[PDB]
């Protein structure tokens, strides 16, 4: 290895770990947690931030001085990509847009960009790549999310044969856009879950295991080429979770079997707002699509990471949702949500 890359120190902030990460899109739900874990043992992060530095300012206090090197880039510029990963041991990609935008179509964020970084980073001389792909993604899905991620996943794997692909099932956390999303029904009237939601099962995973997997995938040599599926330790019918998290929030559970065709139009009506849409037609059916349990794909336990159940790692994110009426409460209280356990 390069002379100024040998791991040193006991893993502190001012200890050179050796990994030279270039995390893409760190200003997100998962990017903050991974860049923290990469900053927690002393890896010089080279993130191209693109938004205002103010929104990227909160990433400063998770690394030693002169470690988190903010860089300017453009998504539609190859030269922008080339500069940031010119000298990097690894490159980590999380470019993802949950809703549909005018400037970026859904395939722009999942077909062009994920492959647009693999070949140039290989051209620059990288050694690794941890581009992630949603586990639920399917080529013939009715959601643009699952189609676009699948077709981009093969391109990045083909362009970079050693590109480890992570398959997160449902990364729940503080602002995971599921738990708060499920909490968001309180203002939006009756929960418009279709057919009362008795026909869809999800397997969610607590986010920091996934980031722990990413760093583990970085230091594990076997990760190159392989594809990892990241799922939690228990799965739930979505009617349980909505009743569950409403009970953890102690809010009045108010389910309503709204017809599928109604929510289809309503989803795009939510998108009419020019700013960040609350709900997208791509997510209307993405929720109602269940999870697969492909066994041949190695998981967290094979990678050396135990998966925390959602029940235990819920009170952290949940406390924001509950008002004073049960703010002082603690864990338990809500029933242990019944798992179907594959």
């Amino acid at each position: 290895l390069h002379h100024a890359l040998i791991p040193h120190g006991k893993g502190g902030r001012s200890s050179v770990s050796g990994i030279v990460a270039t995390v893409f899109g760190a200003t997100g739900f998962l990017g903050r947690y991974v860049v923290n874990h990469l900053g927690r043992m002393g890896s010089q992060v080279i993130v191209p931030y693109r938004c205002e530095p103010y929104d990227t300012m909160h990433l400063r206090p998770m690394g030693d001085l002169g470690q988190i090197i903010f860089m300017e880039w453009n998504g539609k510029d190859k030269d922008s990509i080339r500069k940031v990963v010119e000298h990097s041991n690894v490159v980590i990609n999380l470019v993802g847009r949950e809703w549909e935008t005018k400037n970026f179509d859904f395939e722009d964020v999942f077909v062009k960009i994920p492959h647009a970084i693999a070949q140039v980073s290989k051209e620059a001389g990288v050694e690794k790549l941890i581009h992630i792909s949603h586990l639920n993604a399917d080529i013939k899905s009715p959601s643009r999310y699952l189609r676009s991620k699948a077709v981009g996943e093969k391109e990045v794997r083909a362009a970079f044969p050693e590109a480890t692909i992570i398959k997160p099932s449902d990364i729940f956390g503080r602002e995971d856009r599921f738990l708060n999303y499920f909490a968001s029904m309180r203002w939006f009237g009756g929960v418009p879950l279709i057919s009362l939601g008795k026909e869809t099962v999800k397997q969610p995973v607590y986010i920091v295991d996934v980031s722990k997997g990413i760093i583990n995938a970085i230091k594990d040599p076997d990760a190159k080429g392989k594809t990892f599926a990241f799922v939690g330790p228990n799965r739930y019918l979505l009617f349980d979770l909505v009743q569950y998290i409403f009970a953890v929030a102690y809010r009045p559970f108010l389910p309503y079997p709204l017809p599928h065709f109604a929510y289809r139009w309503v989803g795009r009506l939510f998108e009419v707002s020019p700013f960040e849409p609350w709900t997208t037609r791509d997510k209307v059916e993405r929720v109602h699509m269940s999870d697969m349990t492909l066994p041949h794909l190695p998981g967290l336990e094979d990678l050396g990471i135990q998966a925390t159940p959602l029940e235990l790692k819920a009170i952290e994110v949940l406390r924001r949702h509950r008002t004073y009426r049960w703010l002082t409460s603690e864990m338990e209280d809500v029933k242990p949500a019944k798992t179907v356990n594959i």
């Binding site: 924001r320 008002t323 004073y324 703010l327």
Partner: protein, 293 residues
């Protein structure tokens, strides 16, 4: 066009509420060897615009343990009140010449205590609870001195019709007959007076209190033909009072609560009663009872 007259009052008062703040900071500034806002625009002329649009762009954080319903209607009342008592002022000719204008002014200005009381309760914090409790008791203590002063003042006026005040004063400022009450009245006005609103609510109260004190004690001559004479005199008098109102803002250590109640109930209330007794018999004493009609 009567609606246009309302906007011809509410907005400029709203701007008047906006624009004496730069007066405050620069008066308070130049008082302490300082300069006040003078770098943003000429002499801080654009400083009020420099803060207001910033405030409306700031996200209004809401406490987790806050009742939203009360947290948003308390400013609704606070602004609604602060821009309502401007309507019966006998400024040239009042918008509303209510025959009981003084009573209406008192009942609706005494209603401001609900806004601060609700704000402390809705906020639901140890600081907010006591601060609301302290503010309201300080306030609810001081209408009894307010009401008696105004009542005893109006014996020599003739009625509660605010327009009649001009006819009563005419010859001399009414302070010369009740100057012990003027200091009695002026001091009481100091203590009686989302977060973006609360600037506006109490602040219009500050100017209107001085506008109310202006017509009450330092009247002017309203020529029937030319009304501009009363306009200039009314504005000039209420400006001098307000400058004095901020003159004392940075000239005394602030009152403490036990003295604040002690000052009224033991050194302000009993003397207010005597003056009221003096001004209830004196119109009878000299056969100078005034005409109501």
């Amino acid at each position: 066009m009567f609606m246009i007259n309302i906007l011809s009052l509410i907005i400029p008062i709203l701007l008047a509420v906006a624009f004496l703040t730069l007066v405050e900071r620069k008066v308070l500034g130049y008082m302490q060897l300082r300069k006040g806002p003078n770098v943003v625009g000429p002499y801080g002329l654009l400083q009020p615009i420099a803060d207001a649009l910033k405030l409306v762009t700031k996200e209004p954080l809401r406490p987790g343990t806050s009742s939203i319903s009360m947290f948003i209607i308390a400013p609704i009342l606070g602004l609604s009140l602060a821009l309502t008592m401007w309507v019966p002022l006998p400024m040239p000719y009042p918008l509303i010449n209510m025959n009981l204008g003084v009573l209406f002014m008192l009942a609706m200005s005494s209603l401001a205590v609900y806004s601060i009381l609700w704000s402390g309760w809705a906020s639901n914090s140890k600081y907010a609870l006591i601060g609301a409790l302290r503010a309201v008791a300080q306030t609810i203590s001081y209408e009894v001195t307010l009401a008696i002063i105004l009542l005893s003042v109006l014996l020599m006026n003739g009625s509660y019709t605010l327009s009649t005040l001009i006819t009563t004063q005419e010859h001399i400022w009414m302070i010369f007959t009740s100057w012990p009450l003027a200091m009695m009245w002026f001091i009481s006005t100091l203590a009686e007076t989302p977060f973006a609103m609360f600037f506006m609510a109490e602040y219009a109260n500050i100017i209107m209190m001085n506008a109310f004190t202006a017509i009450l004690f330092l009247g002017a001559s309203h020529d029937p033909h030319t009304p501009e004479l009363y306009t200039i005199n009314f504005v000039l008098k209420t400006l001098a009072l307000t400058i004095t109102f901020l003159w004392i803002r940075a000239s005394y250590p602030r009152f403490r609560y036990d003295q604040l109640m002690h000052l009224l109930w033991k050194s302000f209330l009993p003397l207010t009663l005597a003056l009221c007794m003096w001004h209830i018999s004196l119109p009878i004493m000299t056969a100078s009872i005034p005409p109501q009609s």
